[PDB]
């Protein structure tokens, strides 16, 4: 019969974040060829019928990955490198390192991912670009530039780069920055609140439901993403597949999503560089404007994030694991 797949996600069930989104999307995409379930840890009371595991995060799921590898030595294990593992933990973390060794297949979420893996792990590495539904590209007003950034506030999102750019632009009534995401890591929420009180063109909206967040991404002239690292960020896909161009920090996770030739990168942590891009976007608002050049480049990336493509890549992965 068809495989019994268990997806391990460290997200809380129903959480509005990437780790929950991937796991629930992979379950939907794989459902026509297998019996699929999502858990936070393995084993559980239903563990005896599972034949394949896809485990997100080499460190956060290392305990379930180890359980699987001990119960199924050399068979049925895929480890998904969701970001903070690939670009932080696998360097020094012995649990992350063991997960890498035990996996039958490693999944990276964009083309550059395997460059961060040990060379001995590259033969068993598999690229699975993520997917999102498209939204109609909307005509937008030339009267103002409205940027949006989306990420639950934590240090890896480097939200200070956005706060520092919003400060450089404090006086520009013709440039608006909306920031969507909960106040997680200590004091980042306080920084956003203080900035919003000083610089009215900057608004921190807190966490928003995914529906409303996709509507905000679709309506913004540009999405800004400042991260220190990303596995391959859902928010960048969401923008691209809405016809909303991106300004992103030049880090491998972002480069993997937007392309080596993309004209909308700033150096990581360079607030002045990001504020200069926002000024260019605004100056451009006929054709030849930076926003138009970036929408052209993003439109060439949009077919990467087709759910039919992700599904075909997952079908191949599952065939390799059973
Ligand atoms: C730092 C890092 O490596 N991040 C990874 C993390 O996702 P992480 O959760 O950090 O970030 P993503 O951008 O990929 O996912 C956030 C998701 O939550 C939604 N959202 C967020 C905040 C908010 O207030 N409202 C809202 O709806 C966004 O629209 C998006 O769908 O795991 C994902 C895979 O599992 C990877 O794709 C990401 O690269």
Residue numbers in the entry: 2 to 286, 291 to 327
From the paper:
SenB catalyzes the generation of the key intermediate selenoglucose product using SeP synthesized by selenophosphate synthetase (named SelD or SenC)15. In contrast to other types of GTs, SenB performs dual functions in two-step catalytic reactions, catalyzing the formation of C–Se glycosidic bonds and the subsequent cleavage of Se-P bonds to generate the final product.
To elucidate the structural basis leading to substrate recognition and the catalytic mechanism of SenB, we solved the structures of SenB complexed with various sugar donors, including the ternary complex SenB/UDP-Glc/PO43- (1.95 Å) and two binary complexes, SenB/UDP-GlcNAc (1.88 Å) and SenB/UDP-GalNAc (1.64 Å). In all solved crystal structures, each asymmetric unit contains three copies of SenB, which are unlikely to be functionally related due to the lack of protein‒protein interactions between them. The acetyl groups in UDP-GlcNAc and UDP-GalNAc may enhance the affinity of SenB for additional hydrophobic interactions with V157 compared to that of other UDP-sugars. The preference of SenB is as follows: UDP-GlcNAc > UDP-GalNAc > UDP-Glc > UDP-Gal > UDP-Rha > UDP-Xyl. Given the chemical structure and catalytic activity of the sugar donor, these findings suggest that the N-acetyl group of C-2′ and the hydroxymethyl group of C-5′ on the sugar moiety contribute to the catalytic efficiency of SenB. Using UDP-GlcNAc and UDP-GalNAc as sugar donors, the corresponding selenophosphate sugar intermediates catalyzed by the K158A mutant were detected through LC‒MS.
